[PDB]
């Protein structure tokens with residue numbers, strides 16, 4: 233089949249343009265996934281109070297800070313209580329002689345009149361719009377979990393649909409669905425509706441993710457395939473800096489969601505100029521259309537040998553690919569074959585740890601440091617060198633030590649975050665960034681390692697099981713943030729322990745580097 237592509241041009245103008253387009257689309261998709269750091273940022277809040285907020289009331293000479301002392305009780309975090317207010321104004325606290333014994337918990341009431349939010353950084357967020365605070369604090373991580381479950385279901389549906397209808401058609405409708413559901417979510421009137429539309433948007437995101445990579449492989453000669461996979465991975469790295477810049481420019485959540493959704497109407501449009509995969513068309517029994525597509529691409533590449541191709545050449549040569557359908561395998565087959573039991577268990581655990589840790593940490597940057605725009609930028613800045621150095625080490629020192637060291641380093645960097653003093657926000661930010669870079673390198677290492685652990689027919693099923701395990705773990709990722717009620721150290725402790733244990737499992741895998 234590669235010789236046909238060399239009769240069409242296995243790496244030329246067409247592949248360059250296609251790669252550029254799909255890289256850009258992946259950048260915007262990454263912005264879609266990371267958006268809720270800025271769309272659902274939690275501004276500081278307090279109950280609405282008659283004295284503080286009703287400017288129409290009788291004015292007084294007291295300073296704003298004195299009124300804040302008079303109205304809102306002190307909270308655990310050495311700050312105003314974010315969910316309670318005094319039943320009656322506590323004038324007695326105004327004198328410096330006041331003591332905590334002067335007021336009882338019975339003298340505080342939960343916010344009846346709602347909350348007042350800080351607008352200095354963000355003009356509006358879904359948290360401020362729908363009051364996802366206090367009793368409703370669980371609703372933000374629940375929304376993120378619903379988005380990731382949408383990704384899981386979309387990935388499940390993409391395979392059968394992609395085989396029945398083709399890569400390009402599914403990619404086109406995935407683009408359209410992403411644009412429509414991102415625009416619908418921006419104007420949602422209520423929180424449940426917002427969750428529904430985010431779920432369907434993730435449903436489309438999964439199809440874009442899968443079909444972009446699949447369709448890039450099948451039009452590229454084998455001598456350039458790994459480079460294309462690397463560039464596809466780097467598009468995600470650039471998506472973080474894109475998110476940082478766009479969110480820095482746009483401080484309003486509706487406009488931000490709209491801005492990151494509009495680009496996919498253009499992606500939908502240029503998807504119509506993309507040719508469908510020739511392998512799929514021939515295997516489906518459509519040689520004429522496949523020949524049309526191949527002559528199309530050869531014309532794009534300015535390649536003369538379009539004169540030579542005929543349907544007889546296509547059918548006779550690719551017949552061996554058409555014959556490939558004869559040997560299916562199940563997930564149950566992986567677990568039944570004695571020796572693959574161990575490899576499957578540990579590999580699945582590593583995939584699960586990657587997804588769990590990355591999407592647990594990356595979606596609450598507001599806890600990891602001071603400035604979230606710079607954190608979002610810097611995880612993208614670190615991801616690139618991390619992944620390419622991971623490739624260098626993986627070609628030098630083998631799969632097993634590199635994967636183990638990457639996961640262990642990520643775990644140790646995240647665990648240290650729980651031990652460092654809070655005053656050193658800079659050091660904490662650096663450690664968090666390094667941990668996420670380590671997780672990205674582990675993603676690279678496992679992506680390559682999985683294809684080598686298993687025999688050829690089971691290779692694809694094993695990779696599918698791993699990816700599905702990662703998508704399932706990402707769902708549990710955000711929910712662990714609910715444990716933060718007992719202190720922010722516990723979510724980070726979980727996020728840190730998991731990669732450590734999965735790295736210590738990586739040491740037990742068998743090596744595959746040829747020596």
Ligand SMILES: *[C@@H]1O[C@H](CO)[C@@H](O)[C@H](O)[C@H]1NC(C)=O
Nearest residue numbers: 282285286287288289290345
């Ligand atoms: C603010 O004070 C005025 C005083 O006349 C009152 O009528 C109004 O209801 C107060 N606002 C709220 C939200 O209670």
